[PDB]
């Protein structure tokens, strides 16, 4: 979870590059998780094309992470309003556009600029207002 | 926690890897499974002899008696797939697909 804190510690806007690097690392982390799942449940033929599968998945996920990070912080600095759902929206769904480009289909990329963008807006929403996804037993 | 505890815990971790990460053999996998309980048996005996838990001295053999029973059926299942399929090689073990 310290990797997630490596994103949380950096505030939006200030030191955009380190925030982007943290986003790259987190995208690579989820990328390696999904690549391990693919390499484990889906059987390949040769080690080279298996690690090629992992490379495609990781490089994709890292691309969404990278652009999300950089665009989020630049949106936070140019408008000097880190507390903005759109700040996360634009970069989150440009991540969807880049994902669609990675899978060479801009149709699902456009469909992604809805869903990835809205979800980034919602996670920003929760982070501002303390919305819990995993609430502790309280009452 | 001294090195003996490390060694038997670490032996259990690699038994977990060996049995659970199947290579190609069902018999060798359940062999790793029963080695697993050997590691746990030694581990359990350690604290129990250490702390003078006099009653718990009977827990290992109890823990033993059931565990072999598992293997008692495991290998017993092994023959039942073997006579029809031919081997214990679990890659033909695919008939139940959908």
């Amino acid at each position: 979870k310290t990797l997630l804190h490596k994103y949380s510690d950096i505030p939006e806007g200030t030191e955009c590059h380190r925030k982007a690097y943290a986003s790259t690392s987190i995208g690579g982390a989820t990328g390696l998780i999904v690549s391990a799942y693919s390499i484990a449940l889906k059987p390949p033929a040769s080690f080279l094309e298996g690690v090629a599968r992992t490379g495609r998945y990781t490089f994709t996920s890292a691309a969404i992470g990278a652009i999300f990070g950089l665009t989020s912080c630049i949106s936070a600095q140019v408008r000097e309003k880190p507390d903005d759902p759109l700040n996360y929206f634009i970069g989150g769904c440009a991540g969807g556009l880049t994902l669609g480009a990675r899978t060479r289909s801009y149709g699902i990329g456009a469909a992604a600029c809805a869903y990835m963008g809205l979800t980034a807006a919602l996670v920003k929403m929760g982070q501002l207002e303390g919305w819990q996804v995993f609430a502790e037993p309280k009452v | 926690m001294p090195l003996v505890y490390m060694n038997i815990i670490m032996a259990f971790a690699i038994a977990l890897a060996g049995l659970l990460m199947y290579r190609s053999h069902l018999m060798s996998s359940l062999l790793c499974l029963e080695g697993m309980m050997l590691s746990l048996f030694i581990m359990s005996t350690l604290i129990i002899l250490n702390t003078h838990f006099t009653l718990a001295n009977m827990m290992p053999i109890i823990l033993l008696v059931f565990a072999a029973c598992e293997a008692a059926l495991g290998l017993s299942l092994l023959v039942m797939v073997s006579n029809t399929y031919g081997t214990d090689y679990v890659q033909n073990l695919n008939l139940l697909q959908c």
Binding site: I33, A40, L41 | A17, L20, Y22, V90, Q91
Partner: protein, 60 residues
Amino acid sequence: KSASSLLDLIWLETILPKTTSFIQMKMSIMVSNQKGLIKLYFLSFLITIMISMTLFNYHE
């Protein structure tokens, strides 16, 4: 060409109903099409063990 067909019978039905149904399409056959090999299932148990253990660090 704008009220009927393209909007009602092309667009709105594509966005909410058909796109979500296609998502369920594409994610039902990548979820429920495992051959049945005990190996790959067990390595799915495997990497889950560490993701629960150290990667997420559930205990921490």
